[PDB]
Amino acid sequence: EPQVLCYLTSWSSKRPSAGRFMPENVDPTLCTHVIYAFATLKDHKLTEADEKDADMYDKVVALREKNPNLKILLAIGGWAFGSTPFKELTSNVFRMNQFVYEAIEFLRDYQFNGLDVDWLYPRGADDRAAFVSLLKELRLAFEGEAKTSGQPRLLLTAAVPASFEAIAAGYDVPEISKYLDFINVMTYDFHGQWERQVGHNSPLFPLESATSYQKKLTVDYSAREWVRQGAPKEKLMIGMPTYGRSFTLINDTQFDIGAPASGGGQAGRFTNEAGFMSYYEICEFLREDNTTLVWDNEQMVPFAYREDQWVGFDDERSLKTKMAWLKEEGFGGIMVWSVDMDDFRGSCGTGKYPLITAMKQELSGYKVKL
């Protein structure tokens, strides 16, 4: 029963032209869960991050109206949110607990199936405990709300980093595994525009060339590191990106892995952030005159370059290769960032939703067992 958790970004509705994505562009039979990103905290209380995000929460739910087994979650936090609103939330108990109690109310008001807690990232010994405390009080209050109210319990999931260094620094893995329904490993952003050398967003395996250090910055090593630190395989949802990480090359003749980069690459027309492109933006890039598509047979992922623009991404083949690895490793399913950056319109010339469809196909008939 492999689970497929799909993140829906709220800000995708603000995209121009075709890029614009709304909750009813979602194929309600694709994913097993849809997670809406993100909400915020208004004085340590879970709330809408924008005034008529509200009607969107209502639109993203009632995807259930056409798939009643579909679970809809609300996400809190994310990258831009930072760590500060979480240290505050968890600095004292009345604050944290009244957040829990009121979040349930909030969640039930909108008829969300659960909460995805995305604190990026706890660091150090007291952040470690605050994170476990937060997860414990929420999970326990959820359990205890189900038997006072008599409804199916609210779900508790959390997104977690890939880096082994990040795991040690902020994550008591046996403890959070205990309270989380689902552990969403963000096995992407291994390399990107913060770096001055070309590297791939999401390599499954490393180059044989690689330093022992970077042999660790792979989907395979990361997911396994989590298993090593206590994580139950059936709760491990391995992250799958539908975007690629792009670079501007210092020199056009140097396009290989490790090639010097001045920084991020040209923003896509619709996502408007230099450093990455959606998959439908990748497709246009591929269609352009003399773009060179390269398959990395060691890393099992593709990248492509034209002139001084270089992008490493996931396609149908690499994602299926990862599904074969995941079934072989016995993981409980996948997490997708994000449903709105897959080619949902089918403009790439393949099917509609070609990336998530590919992963679905390869997961068919897979039962996770122990």
Ligand X SMILES: CC(=O)N[C@@H]1[C@@H](O)[C@H](O[C@@H]2O[C@H](CO)[C@@H](O[C@@H]3O[C@H](CO)[C@@H](O[C@@H]4O[C@H](CO)[C@@H](O[C@@H]5O[C@H](CO)[C@@H](O)[C@H](O)[C@H]5NC(C)=O)[C@H](O)[C@H]4NC(C)=O)[C@H](O)[C@H]3NC(C)=O)[C@H](O)[C@H]2NC(C)=O)[C@@H](CO)O[C@H]1O
Ligand Y SMILES: *[C@@H]1O[C@H](CO)[C@@H](O)[C@H](O)[C@H]1NC(C)=O
First to last CA, the chain: 13
Site string for ligand Y, 217-256 (x = CB under 6 A): ----------------------------------x-xx--
CA distance 53 to 47: 10
Check: CB of residue 210 under 8 Å from CB of residue 218. no
Q: Tell me which of ligand X, ligand Y, none is bound by residue 251, counting a contact when its beta carbon lies within the kind-specific cut-off of 5 to 8 angstroms.
A: ligand Y
One residue of 70, 72, 186, 319 binding ligand X per CB under 6 A? 186
Which position's Cβ is nearest ligand Y?
A: 251
Part of the chain binding ligand X (CB under 6 A), chosen from 103-111, 136-144, 190-198, 354-362? 190-198
Q: Does 243 bind ligand X (CB under 6 A)?
A: yes
CB of 276 to ligand X, least distance (A): 5
For residue 203, how many other CB atoms are within 10 A of its CB? 28
Going by the DSSP 8-state scheme, the letter that residue 334 receives in this structure is E
What is the distance, to the nearest Å, from the Cα of residue 223 to the centroid of all Cα atoms in its chain?
A: 14
Q: How many residues bind ligand Y (CB under 6 A)?
A: 3
One residue of 27, 48, 53, 118 binding ligand X per CB under 6 A? 118
CA distance 254 to 343: 30
CB of 93 to ligand X, least distance (A): 25
Stated length of the chain: 370
Q: Which of residues 49-88 bind ligand X (CB under 6 A)?
A: 78-81
CA distance 323 to 294: 21
Q: Which residues of 303-333 are buried (b: 16+ CB within 10 A; e: fewer)?
A: bbbbebbbbbbbbbebbbbbbebbbeeebbb
Helix and strand totals (H; E) in the chain: 10, 15
Q: Would you say 8 or 323 has its CB closer to ligand X?
A: 8
Q: Would you say 218 or 357 has its CB closer to ligand X?
A: 218
The residues binding ligand Y (CB under 6 A) are 251, 253-254
Q: Where along the sequence are the contacts to ligand X (CB under 6 A)?
A: 9, 11, 38, 78-81, 118, 120, 159, 161, 163, 166, 186, 189-190, 192, 194, 217, 243, 271-273, 276, 337
